[PDB]
Amino acid sequence: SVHVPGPHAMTIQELVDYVNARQKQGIYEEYEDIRRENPVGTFHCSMSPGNLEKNRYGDVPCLDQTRVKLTKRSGHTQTDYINASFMDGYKQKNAYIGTQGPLENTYRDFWLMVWEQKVLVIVMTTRFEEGGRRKCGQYWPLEKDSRIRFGFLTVTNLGVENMNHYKKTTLEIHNTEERQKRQVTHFQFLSWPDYGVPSSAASLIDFLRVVRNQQSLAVSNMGARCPEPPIVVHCSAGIGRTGTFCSLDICLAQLEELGTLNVFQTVSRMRTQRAFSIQTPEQYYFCYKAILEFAEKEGMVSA
Ligand SMILES: COc1cc(CC(=O)NC[C@@H](NC(=O)[C@H](CCCNC(=O)c2cccc(I)c2)NC(=O)[C@H](Cc2ccc(C(F)(F)P(=O)(O)O)cc2)NC(=O)c2ccc(Br)c(C)c2)C(N)=O)ccc1O
DSSP states (O other), rough: OOOOOOOOOBBBHHHHHHHHHHHHHHHEEEEEEESSSOOOSHHHHHSTTTGGGGSSSSSSOOOOTBBBBOOOOOOSOSOOOOOOEEEEEEEEEEEEEEOOOOGGGGGHHHHHHHHHHOOOEEEEOOOOOETTOOOOOOOOOOSOEEEETTTEEEEEEEEEEEOSEEEEEEEEEEETTTTTTEEEEEEEOOOOOOOSSSOOSSHHHHHHHHHHHHHHHHHHHHHHOOOOEEEEOOOSSSSSSHHHHHHHHHHHHHHHHHHHHHHHHHHHHHHSSSSTOOHHHHHHHHHHHHHHHHHHHHHHHOO
């Protein structure tokens, strides 16, 4: 994994002084420096003729080096492309698959990926539309007992539960080709504001804990094998909220295990796997602020 502890990780005390020395504008400038760096890798496949219409945004292609390839077939007329990238987690290879919100012409590709990668948990961080801007297609059956057929894959809704900050949907994926069934849990975070970033990270971090626990539970009940299937995480382009969710998970994981973390390191590293991760300086600043807010809630900060 590219996410290893350090070099030069910081303690909470050190992070506090770090952010205080730079202030909000200093953190914003730091994001711009990351932003300016030349991407590490190429985007030929994502921009190649034939895969263009599979991208929700022409300005958000995925890296050739880390893209998730579909093991489709010949004749059926299609490609092995999907705008999705394997992303490492804290001391864990391929902990996530960051991807865009599925398009009607990619719904089947999305589920094929979920099946092939043996995914057990899907994390959605947006609504279908926000402020008139489309961000995700309705790729799953919304109500209990409803089902959608995607060729040889049938997805059925086994139950829905609305929480104060997220919605949990249990789905059954039936592969008629292999004659096998699997259950996947779909989580939709509901508290990310239409504008800006969350005013408090408490709900997002609690949601992360729920996701972590379900992945752990699902893994414990799955058949012997991915070294731990990846968690699919998506937002409109699969870089902003997706990058934030994943960066926080990684930083908090290191913080829990060693009491240290490095936002700059984590984000720089993540951008070499899911290009363009963290889309605005506000989101970047939010990563720092969320960690500091978490520290205060955990009683780790003296003013
Ligand atoms: C610090 O000073 C400040 C600076 C700002 C400016 C700012 O943030 N704005 C940046 C803007 N980002 C942008 O432009 C990005 C571009 C992504 C990076 N690519 C490249 O650039 C690129 C492309 C090809 C090759 C190479 I090498 C690089 N585009 C976008 O903003 C969106 C895609 C997008 C990304 C993220 C999100 C999200 F955050 F909401 P999410 O959490 O759901 O994912 C939503 C949508 N793009 C599009 O709408 C779109 C679609 C089709 C076509 Br053709 C084009 C040209 C654009 C954004 N997302 O906002 C604002 C306030 C400040 O204070």
